[PDB]
Amino acid sequence: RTYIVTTILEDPYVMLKKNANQFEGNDRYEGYCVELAAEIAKHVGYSYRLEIVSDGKYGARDPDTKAWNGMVGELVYGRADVAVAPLTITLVREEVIDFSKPFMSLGISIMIKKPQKSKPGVFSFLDPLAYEIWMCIVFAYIGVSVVLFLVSRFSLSGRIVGGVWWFFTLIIISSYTANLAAFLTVERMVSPIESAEDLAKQTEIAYGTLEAGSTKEFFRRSKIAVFEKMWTYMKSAEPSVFVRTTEEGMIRVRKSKGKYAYLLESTMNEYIEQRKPCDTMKVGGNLDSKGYGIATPKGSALRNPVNLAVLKLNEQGLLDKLKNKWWYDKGECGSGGGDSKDKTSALSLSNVAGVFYILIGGLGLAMLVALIEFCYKSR
Amino acid sequence: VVVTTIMESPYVMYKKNHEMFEGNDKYEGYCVDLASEIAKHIGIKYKIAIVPDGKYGARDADTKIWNGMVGELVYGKAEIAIAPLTITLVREEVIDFSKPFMSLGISIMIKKPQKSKPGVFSFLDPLAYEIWMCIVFAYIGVSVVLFLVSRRSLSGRIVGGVWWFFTLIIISSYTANLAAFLTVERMVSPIESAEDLAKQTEIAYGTLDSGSTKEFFRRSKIAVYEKMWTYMRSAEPSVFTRTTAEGVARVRKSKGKFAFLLESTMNEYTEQRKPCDTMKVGGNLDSKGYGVATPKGSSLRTPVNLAVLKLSEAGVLDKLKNKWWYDKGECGPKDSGSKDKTSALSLSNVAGVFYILVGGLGLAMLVALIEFCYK
Amino acid sequence: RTYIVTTILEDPYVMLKKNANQFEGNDRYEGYCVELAAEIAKHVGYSYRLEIVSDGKYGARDPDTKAWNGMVGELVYGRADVAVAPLTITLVREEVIDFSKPFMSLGISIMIKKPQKSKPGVFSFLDPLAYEIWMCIVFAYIGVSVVLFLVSRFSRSLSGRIVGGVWWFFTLIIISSYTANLAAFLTVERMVSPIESAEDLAKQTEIAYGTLEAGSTKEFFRRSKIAVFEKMWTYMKSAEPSVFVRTTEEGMIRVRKSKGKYAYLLESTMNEYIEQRKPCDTMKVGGNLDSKGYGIATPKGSALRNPVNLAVLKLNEQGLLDKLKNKWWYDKGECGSGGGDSKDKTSALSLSNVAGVFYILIGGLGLAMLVALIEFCYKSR
Amino acid sequence: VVVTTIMESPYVMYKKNHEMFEGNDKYEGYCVDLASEIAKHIGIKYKIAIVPDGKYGARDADTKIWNGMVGELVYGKAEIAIAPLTITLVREEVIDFSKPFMSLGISIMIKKPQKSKPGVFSFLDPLAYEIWMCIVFAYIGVSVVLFLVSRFSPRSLSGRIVGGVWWFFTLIIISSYTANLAAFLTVERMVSPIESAEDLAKQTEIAYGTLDSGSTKEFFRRSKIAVYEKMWTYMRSAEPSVFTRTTAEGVARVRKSKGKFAFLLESTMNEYTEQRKPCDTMKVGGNLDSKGYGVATPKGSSLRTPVNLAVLKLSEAGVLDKLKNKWWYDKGECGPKDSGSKDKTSALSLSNVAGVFYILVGGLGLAMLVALIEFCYKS
Amino acid sequence: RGVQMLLTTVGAFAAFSLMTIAVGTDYWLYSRGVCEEVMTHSGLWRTCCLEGNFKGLCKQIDHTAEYFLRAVRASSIFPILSVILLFMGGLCIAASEFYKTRHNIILSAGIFFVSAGLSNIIGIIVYISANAGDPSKKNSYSYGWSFYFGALSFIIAEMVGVLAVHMFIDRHKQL
Amino acid sequence: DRGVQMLLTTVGAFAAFSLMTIAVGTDYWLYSRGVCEEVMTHSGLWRTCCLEGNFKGLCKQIDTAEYFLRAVRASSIFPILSVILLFMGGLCIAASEFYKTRHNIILSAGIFFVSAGLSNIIGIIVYISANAGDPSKKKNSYSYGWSFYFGALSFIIAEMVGVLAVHMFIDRHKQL
Ligand SMILES: O=c1[nH]c2cc(C(F)(F)F)c(N3CCOCC3)cc2n(CP(=O)(O)O)c1=O
Ligand SMILES: O=c1[nH]c2cc(C(F)(F)F)c(N3CCOCC3)cc2n(CP(=O)(O)O)c1=O
Ligand SMILES: O=c1[nH]c2cc(C(F)(F)F)c(N3CCOCC3)cc2n(CP(=O)(O)O)c1=O
Ligand SMILES: O=c1[nH]c2cc(C(F)(F)F)c(N3CCOCC3)cc2n(CP(=O)(O)O)c1=O
């Protein structure tokens, strides 16, 4: 006999094929879930037919006024055989149907925009001061030069002018050194965001999640002290969650210039790490431990072979290979497919380039006015 | 049972949804939640009522009638006073009070201490005056010993080396101190930080026209509050404020301004209000308390006393105060300090050396002119 | 008729007079509570004869034996009407007797050992570059001097220019190192802040703190539900050293022995008294953790319940309580007579730590003038 | 009801030395408290078995006799077994398994370095590298242009301009150097030379050793991903006997020496050693694999479903993370002092300043050699 | 010879014209003040709004050691003495080019030029200190080239002063 | 002051030889506390031996940009260079005292004096950099022995005999 499987149209798992109608049938979708289904069908041995759920939603086992939705409802209604799909393990789903094995670990990630600061040229030279300060320093240079010239041509006024100029440049150099040291050690002592206690301690970047779902249930039923503090901080909702769906929150975080954060699943973050343009990274560890599974009927003969095959594939490592190739080969990013940036501190000819440029410009002006002097000697 | 409550900003708010329900759950804050907590602790059917007098209750001592919540309690129109009220000797033989659940006293609040922006003192901030005219003494000593040895040699090399090393240590210490000052940008609290440090300072202080503060300041025998009273009386007539709104408008204008001398309730309320600019408490003075009231011959006095005492000891009013006074705030920078952008140095922090250099050049050209004139 | 009052002497209330037994008994008692008792006896009018407590305790609930002790135990079991000795307020004390008013506001205070500022002399001058490299630069200077002398006498020259340049590079690099190091010391000594409140104490870990077992502070901390106090209790539970102490005196002498990192969290009055004690080894910071209070104790149905209430309210309103507190807590204190002895907080390099360069400057000019005199007298020979 | 657990694990311990709360409620730790928590839910009779066998559980091919907790389960002496079982195939075809309550994965181990005291590299560490000979090239340029200016037409304006711009150069370069060195000394940031498993395979400078025999060694020998093939080929050329016999020997060896002899172990034991008395450990994060620890029952019975629902309902409820957090982060005193300590001033010793001393002394030496040589040969 | 006399004379005349167009229109500083960050052009004695609903509505403006600096900034005695000193220097050079028999007038005029540069630098530094000494709480610090041709006046005054010194040396050598 | 200066130079050379022999014969190079528990030990390059403890009598010695420094510290070429250059300078001044007709020998002797100063100063700096590099821990350290003081005395007496020899070499060549 034949068997039917169901899958929900999702970006990290199902590809909407561009050719589409010219290749219909079993070869209509490609991706992680359908390749897993093909591998486990080759392992156990049967014929599988793909199907699409009517509502297009994950569904839940909430005890509402009947009308259960999702794969769990579609399978408890009896018109299903197996259901391979991204599904979160929960007790209400476990109460009527069991799952085989957790083949993937999920956690809660934190969204941080990519910090990129291009180093300027001559602008960075004048950065640790003011423009009117440089105007005044060149004005004072002209003033001390003309006083020295007049006291040389008139003839200890020259000595006292030299002394006050030495005192003046003494203070100028000390002040500039102090200001530059202050700026660089302020830039050094920055703290990147890791885990949750840093977020609870900074109280400067807004963080939120979806209005409902597993993350909202975890936040509402939170009991970790730092997570309880974070939940109470988010309960004020002065800027609120300000989100409607996943892509809307992603757009808001990207347009917030790093001033906003979102708490979404580690699977979604790892998928969006390379598919999206490289502006967000994963930091810290998983905030919670949860897994996935494959839905099987509680009283069917296809309960043990599916578990055995999925656990064999998990132990073999071909699942890890397929996940790695699907999540790294077809990625529009170079954060993980190429070399990263090594933090070596120090400088790399970035801010001192402009003063080198004005150095060469001053030597050029000096040698051209010396050429003018030599041509005046030619006469 | 019926209870009166006066409209005040730390305690009871009108709900945003005014049309949600008229009656019990129409107000939120500290006072109504405390009333609900003691009602749940004891067990009674309670409502919410508002006194139509607008006063807190003071004996006029001429017509012999009591007003406010105490007047409503005395004249047989109320039996519970959940509205906070300070305990006073005059309002004890006419109404009986419970044990105080909140401790408050006369406190100091000052305007926002910003960064200093001087013209000459900014250059004077690193090191000190003593070191600087000791530098002057060292310089004139170097000059006189150079003139002595003048009348290539070992002595000249030695004196040049030690002078170079000396000014080297001076520049290094100066640069280190200035770098530390720019790195930390640590603010220093003003002079008004204690009772006496408020006493000898020249900053003008202001208060309300009448109230607990004026009543306490009418009679004194401490010989420091006497000095404060003489300072207040000899100052400008703008010290007295008819309303605290005019006073806060005055104190937000000037850096020194007319600083308040009031109880800590409005201090801790306004340190975390919408304009988070002043969050200063300084020290504490005097001692007061807030408690509920009960008329005589009523058996619920002992029950409400035990209820409020148990609630204070196991701890539920401290939770309410922390939730609705510190957690409930428009800004988070008051509870935990933050940093600020260092930004550019501008010129006002370095304007001192410019004037000194240009004046030195000017005096050099005058003394050159005098040298030409006398020769 | 006559009346008796039960008081307990711990500190500094029922301290005995200087002449001890030379007085007549009751008339030899100085302190806060005895003066308050005399005043409130003068307000309404009754005999203020002093009694002696039996066991010296303050009283505690013992539901297992259904007994009582202390001043409250003496008052509940007859033969007592007024307990002048101040005591804390618990639920059982209000259940068995009644208090009128709290005559003072007080709570739990967090303390720290007072640091001492001792600026050294010439030692701080060579401090920011260890010890040996000052020696190294001294012989480096005489080495560059001997090289310069030999190249000047043995020979403008190219060999002199490179020596001058490398000496210049040496001076600028080592003085940049000295400036960076001194900025490091100043910054590190500057951004640190003294402890304050309870939450800043909660993030701090190496400072440590602990309280006595036989006290209401431990019961308050164990029964607290505040998340900050929850963290307090959870860290206090994981105590590997002997953090707990039995009595106050042993804990305080242990604190004075270390005086680098501890906090005991005792009651406000005792901490203020220690602040006014001749050791002068602590500073008080922060505010009251809780809102505990004192009060006077009277039996039920007595005729001296309402007059004592009006009397204590009269003392609260008149400010004579503050007068007695100032007199017996600041005037009699032998330490900290001038509390504002250090309040300028002038945080800058003064003459007390940079004077080493001045001393070596004066020494160098002294040697310079002696060798100049030696050259002059050699010429005069 | 008899429940069994292993004693040679960092999850159970003996209270004090002897006669400390004798009975069933004698041992304390994560495993026994988790067993009590899952017993209090369904209502099973808690007990202690702790029978040892010298091994955690295995199946020899020639003997065909199972051992350990699984060996006790298959032949039958208990019905509930809570113990740290890595669920795999060969134990799955014999007895069932429940949903794991925690994640797993092999994580690399490196001893955390304290500081670095180099020689010439300490001198060259601040600023940059190419800046130094950029100044020496600029100095050569100023010298040659000054000499040609003097030779063409011997001070004047050109000398004043070139002297002023050279003075500006020396002040700006010393100000930048002083600012950088001050920012280095005030606060420091630690990143470690190791960052990831791919970088671990790429660096090829630190010795790696998994174990003499175990799950890690079996996974390494049976791996399939090319980076793990590179790691295995590195393991083939293992000269200094990196085949660690015991886990205690490996951590004892990596504690003494940090330059080499890195250890490979699971995340649980690594995080346990993170909070131990030497207090000197470091991990980079990221799990190479994904396993878990779960309970097992002899075949299927009524206790299977009860314990599965009990451990799952404990997994969504915040109590298992409670136990994990409180145990692992409260019996370890090293991690209480989070981040770092700013009370480490010290001073500039000789080792990081002596490089310029060597440069100065060599410069004066070669200067007087070349001076005597040129005076002896030119004349 | 006389070519440098013509050069310094036309330089002084250009200095006077540049001075009077400096002390003429009030187009000194551009700031995002309030007539809301509305753009107004501020000078010395008067400030009006170049765009907004208040077009055509122009209003007057004003402003131990700090008291002296703010009094100097409000009174603006430094530009007054600068322009008086420059006018006296111009009259002296006019007398010098008219009366050839006078000797010390060239040195005097050089002194007036150097002190005019002195007055210019003290005036500009006190102006920057005055208008940057009130930071209050973006593009507030904008310049409309006014200080640029103030710098031009400074450098041309310095040039004519050093030329006057050089020709005093020349005419003393010719004596 | 010419013959007395000859006497001063030869006495300084003999004192330099005596200080070199004392330095190479020194057993208490540095007062370092440790284990033979932290107790005071007399650190020695040839024999690092203890004075207090139950193990007195038996004792054993201590042992790109880092290999060379460690190698030259272990081989201890600095005392060898110091004694070789000092002996060469002393032989040169002794020969100059013997036969006076040559004048380049005293300039040469000044050259060996300044190169011996070079050698012992680089030996001092390499030894301090070698023994100061112990970042593993030791609350109390340093407290250097008198060997460093004797080496400093040798360095200063070498530089003063060098400058005196060069100065009067130029002199005696001038009046020649
Ligand atoms: O079984 C479930 N499996 C789920 C699997 C995923 C994911 F893997 F990411 F696709 C998500 N995503 C969460 C992030 O935004 C996109 C959807 C939600 C799931 N939900 C609903 P929750 O309760 O909101 O987690 C379930 O119920
Ligand atoms: O018990 C008392 N508690 C009081 C508590 C407060 C407040 F701080 F707001 F909570 C005030 N505010 C003083 C400032 O203006 C607004 C009302 C008055 C109180 N009064 C009357 P007072 O005599 O004017 O102090 C009492 O009697
Ligand atoms: O009524 C009470 N009044 C108390 C008054 C004081 C004091 F501060 F000395 F006035 C103290 N001290 C606290 C500091 O250590 C020494 C004893 C304890 C009191 N206790 C016991 P606790 O509060 O359970 O420790 C009471 O019960
Ligand atoms: O059931 C099992 N549970 C196990 C649990 C653990 C851990 F939790 F980490 F303590 C370990 N650690 C492996 C690393 O060294 C320390 C011990 C081994 C286990 N093994 C043997 P494996 O075959 O080597 O995994 C089992 O059989």
Q: Is A181 helix (H, G, I), strand (E, B) or coil?
A: helix
Q: Are F136 and F123 contacting, i.e. CB atoms less than 8 angstroms apart?
A: no
Q: What count of other Cβ atoms lies within 10 Å of the Cβ of residue A60?
A: 19
Give domain limits for chain A: 3-104+291-328, 122-190+353-378, 193-275
CATH topology of domain A3-104+291-328: D-Maltodextrin-Binding Protein; domain 2 (3.40.190)
Six token digits for residue D353: 């300043």
User: How far lies C244's CA from each of A116, B321, C274, C290, in Å?
Assistant: 52, 31, 20, 21
Q: Rounded to an integer, what is the distance from CA C363 to the centroid of its chain?
A: 42
Q: Is D262 helix (H, G, I), strand (E, B) or coil?
A: strand
* Architecture of the domain spanning A193-275: 3-Layer(aba) Sandwich (3.40)
DSSP output for A265-277: EHHHHHHHHHHS-
Instruction: Give A280's strand partners.
Output: A113
Q: Choose among C211, C265, C231: nearest CA to D336.
A: C231
User: How far lies E92's CA from each of E4, E12, E20, E88, E106, in Å?
Assistant: 17, 11, 19, 6, 8
Q: Determine whether the interchain pair B353/A183 forms a contact, defined as Cβ–Cβ distance below 8 Å.
A: no
Q: Choose among D282, D274, D334, D335: nearest CA to D108.
A: D282
Q: Are E23 and E142 contacting, i.e. CB atoms less than 8 angstroms apart?
A: no
Instruction: Determine the residue of chain D that is closest to C166 in CA distance.
Output: D360
Same fold across D3-102+292-330 and D107-113+191-274 = yes
Q: Is B206 helix (H, G, I), strand (E, B) or coil?
A: strand
Resolution of the deposited coordinates, in angstroms?
4.2
Q: Determine whether the interchain pair C150/F167 forms a contact, defined as Cβ–Cβ distance below 8 Å.
A: no
D107-113+191-274: CATH, from 3.40.30.10, 3.30.565.10, 1.10.8.10, 3.40.190.10: 3.40.190.10
Long-range contacts of C298-306 (CB under 8 A, 24+ apart): C298/C75, C298/C81, C298/C82, C298/C97, C298/C98, C298/C99, C298/C100, C299/C75, C299/C76, C299/C80, C299/C81, C299/C97, C300/C97, C300/C98, C302/C81, C304/C3, C304/C44, C304/C46, C304/C81, C304/C82, C305/C98, C305/C100
Distinct helix (H) and strand (E) counts, chain E: 5, 5
CA–CA distance, D185 with D175 (Å, rounded to integer): 15
From the list B92, B125, B138, the residue facing C361 with the nearest CB is B138
Packing angle of the helix pair D30-42, D304-316 (nearest 10 deg) = 110
Nearest atom in ligand 1 to the alpha carbon of residue A264 is 14
Q: Are F9 and F17 contacting, i.e. CB atoms less than 8 angstroms apart?
A: no
F3-174: CATH, from 1.20.140.150, 3.10.580.10, 3.30.930.10, 3.40.630.10: 1.20.140.150
Could you tell me the distance, in angstroms and rounded to a whole number, from the CA of residue A261 to the centre of ligand 1? 18
Domain boundaries C110-117+194-285, CATH class: alpha beta
| H/E run at residue B50 | strand B49-50
Q: CB within 8 A of D208, min separation 6: which ones?
A: D108, D200, D231, D234, D235, D242, D262, D264
From the list E65, E121, E122, the residue facing B119 with the nearest CB is E65
CA–CA distance, E84 with E119 (Å, rounded to integer): 10
DSSP output for D151-212: HH---HHHHHHHHHHHHHHHHHHHHHHHHHHHHHHH------S---HHHHHHH--S-EE--S
Could you tell me the distance, in angstroms and rounded to a whole number, from the CA of residue A297 to the centre of ligand 1? 22
Please check whether the domain covering D3-102+292-330 is classified as CATH 3.40.190.10: yes
Please give the DSSP secondary-structure letter assigned to residue D112.
Answer: P
Six token digits for residue E81: 């003495």
Could you tell me the distance, in angstroms and rounded to a whole number, from the CA of residue D252 to the centre of ligand 2? 69
| Residue type for position B344 | A
Q: What count of other Cβ atoms lies within 10 Å of the Cβ of residue C113?
A: 16
Give domain limits for chain F: 3-174
| Residue type for position A36 | L
Burial E46-66 (b: 16+ CB within 10 A, else e): ebbbeeeeeeeeeeeeeeeee
Q: Are E110 and E168 contacting, i.e. CB atoms less than 8 angstroms apart?
A: yes
Give residue D244's region: left, alpha or beta (phi > 0; psi -120 to 50): beta
Stretch 162-221 of chain C: residues touching chain F, C-beta under 8 Å = none
**D363 CB burial (10 A radius; 0-12, 13-18, 19+):** buried
Q: Which residue numbers of C belong to the known binding site for L-glutamate?
A: 86, 88, 93, 216-217, 267
Q: Are D102 and D90 contacting, i.e. CB atoms less than 8 angstroms apart?
A: no
Q: What count of other Cβ atoms lies within 10 Å of the Cβ of residue A83?
A: 25
Six token digits for residue B197: 């440090």
Q: Choose among C180, B182, A94: nearest CA to D315.
A: A94
DSSP output for C273-339: HHHTSTT--EEEES--SS--B---EE-TT-TTSHHHHHHHHHHHHHSHHHHHHHIIIIIS-SS-SSS
Q: CB within 8 A of C56, min separation 6: which ones?
A: C8
Instruction: Determine the residue of chain E that is closest to A140 in CA distance.
Output: E121
User: How far lies B280's CA from each of B54, B271, C107, in Å?
Assistant: 30, 7, 21
Q: Is A42 helix (H, G, I), strand (E, B) or coil?
A: helix
**Side-by-side strand order, sheet with D106-109:** D106-109, D262-266, D208-209
What is the biggest distance separating any 2 CA atoms in chain C, rounded to whole angstroms?
117
| Pick among A168, A201, A202, A205 to test the B interface (most B CBs inside 10 A) | A168
Q: What count of other Cβ atoms lies within 10 Å of the Cβ of residue C55?
A: 11
Instruction: Determine the residue of chain C that is closest to A201 in CA distance.
Output: C203
Question: Ligand 4 in contact with D247 (CB < 6 A)?
Answer: yes
Instruction: Give D86's strand partners.
Output: D293
Burial B332-358 (b: 16+ CB within 10 A, else e): bebeeeeeeeeebbbbbbbbbbbbbbb
Query: In chain A, what residues touch C183 (CB-CB under 8 Å)?
Result: 178, 181
Q: Choose among A85, A149, A79, A151: nearest CA to A295.
A: A85
The distance in angstroms from the start CA to the end CA of chain F is 18
Alpha helices (H) in chain A, listed in sequence order: 32-44, 70-76, 91-94, 122-125, 131-154, 157-188, 197-202, 214-220, 225-236, 246-255, 266-275, 304-316, 318-328, 353-378
Residues in chain C: 381
CATH topology of domain C4-105+293-331: D-Maltodextrin-Binding Protein; domain 2 (3.40.190)
CA–CA distance, C103 with C106 (Å, rounded to integer): 10
| H/E run at residue B289 | strand B284-290
Give residue D55's region: left, alpha or beta (phi > 0; psi -120 to 50): beta
Instruction: Give B12's strand partners.
Output: B29
From the list A181, A228, A229, the residue facing C183 with the nearest CB is A181
Q: Determine whether the interchain pair A164/B367 forms a contact, defined as Cβ–Cβ distance below 8 Å.
A: no
Six token digits for residue A197: 């206690």
Long-range contacts of B163-170 (CB under 8 A, 24+ apart): B165/C357, B166/B138, B166/C357, B166/C361, B168/C175, B169/C125, B169/C354, B169/C357, B170/B135, B170/C357
User: How far lies A378's CA from each of A373, A375, B11, D147, in Å?
Assistant: 9, 5, 93, 19
The answer to whether the Cα torsion of D72, D78, D79, D83 is positive or negative is negative
Q: Determine whether the interchain pair C183/B186 forms a contact, defined as Cβ–Cβ distance below 8 Å.
A: no
Q: CB within 8 A of A138, min separation 6: which ones?
A: none
Peptide bond into C12 cis (omega under 30): yes
Q: What count of other Cβ atoms lies within 10 Å of the Cβ of residue D256?
A: 10
Identify the residue whose tokens are 């490979």.
Answer: D264
Burial C71-82 (b: 16+ CB within 10 A, else e): bbbbbbeeebbb
Please check whether the domain covering B108-115+189-288 is classified as CATH 3.40.50.720: no
Q: Determine whether the interchain pair B186/C182 forms a contact, defined as Cβ–Cβ distance below 8 Å.
A: no
Q: Is E131 helix (H, G, I), strand (E, B) or coil?
A: helix
Alpha helices (H) in chain D, listed in sequence order: 30-42, 68-75, 120-124, 130-152, 156-186, 197-203, 215-221, 226-236, 247-256, 267-274, 304-316, 320-330, 354-378
| Residue type for position B236 | E
Q: Determine whether the interchain pair A91/D138 forms a contact, defined as Cβ–Cβ distance below 8 Å.
A: no
Q: Rounded to an integer, what is the distance from CA C80 to the centroid of its chain?
A: 39
Q: Are D303 and D44 contacting, i.e. CB atoms less than 8 angstroms apart?
A: yes
CA–CA distance, C161 with C178 (Å, rounded to integer): 26
DSSP output for chain F: --HHHHHHHHHHHHHHHHHHHHHHT-S-SEEEEE----EEEEE-SS--EESSSTTTT-------TTHHHHHHHHHTHHHHHHHHHHHHHHHHHHHHHH--S-SHHHHHHHHHHHHHHHHHHHHHHHHHHHHT-------S---B-HHHHHHHHHHHHHHHHHHHHHHHHHHHHH--
Instruction: Determine the residue of chain C that is closest to A225 in CA distance.
Output: C227
CA–CA distance, C363 with F24 (Å, rounded to integer): 35
Six token digits for residue A316: 């073999």
CA–CA distance, C54 with D129 (Å, rounded to integer): 83
CA–CA distance, C354 with C62 (Å, rounded to integer): 65
Q: Are E104 and E138 contacting, i.e. CB atoms less than 8 angstroms apart?
A: no
Q: What count of other Cβ atoms lies within 10 Å of the Cβ of residue E120?
A: 27
Six token digits for residue B239: 């010290």
Please give the DSSP secondary-structure letter assigned to residue C17.
Answer: P
E2-26+66-174: CATH, from 1.20.140.150, 1.20.120.140, 1.10.287.80, 3.30.499.10: 1.20.140.150
CA–CA distance, D180 with A187 (Å, rounded to integer): 11
Long-range contacts of D142-145 (CB under 8 A, 24+ apart): D142/A363, D142/D166, D145/A363, D145/A366, D145/A367
CA–CA distance, F123 with F130 (Å, rounded to integer): 10
DSSP output for B213-230: HHHHHHS--SSSHHHHHH
* Architecture of the domain spanning B1-101+291-335: 3-Layer(aba) Sandwich (3.40)
CA dihedral C242, C245, C246, C249 (to 10 degrees): 140
CA–CA distance, A67 with A78 (Å, rounded to integer): 14
Nearest atom in ligand 1 to the alpha carbon of residue A88 is 1
Q: Are C319 and C228 contacting, i.e. CB atoms less than 8 angstroms apart?
A: no
Distinct helix (H) and strand (E) counts, chain C: 13, 6
Identify the residue whose tokens are 């050791």.
Answer: C279
Q: Rounded to an integer, what is the distance from CA D201 to the centroid of its chain?
A: 15
Q: Choose among E50, D150, D97, C227: nearest CA to A232.
A: C227
Q: CB within 8 A of B227, min separation 6: which ones?
A: B199
Q: What count of other Cβ atoms lies within 10 Å of the Cβ of residue E92?
A: 20
Q: Does A174 touch chain D (CB under 8 A)?
A: no
| H/E run at residue C272 | helix C268-275
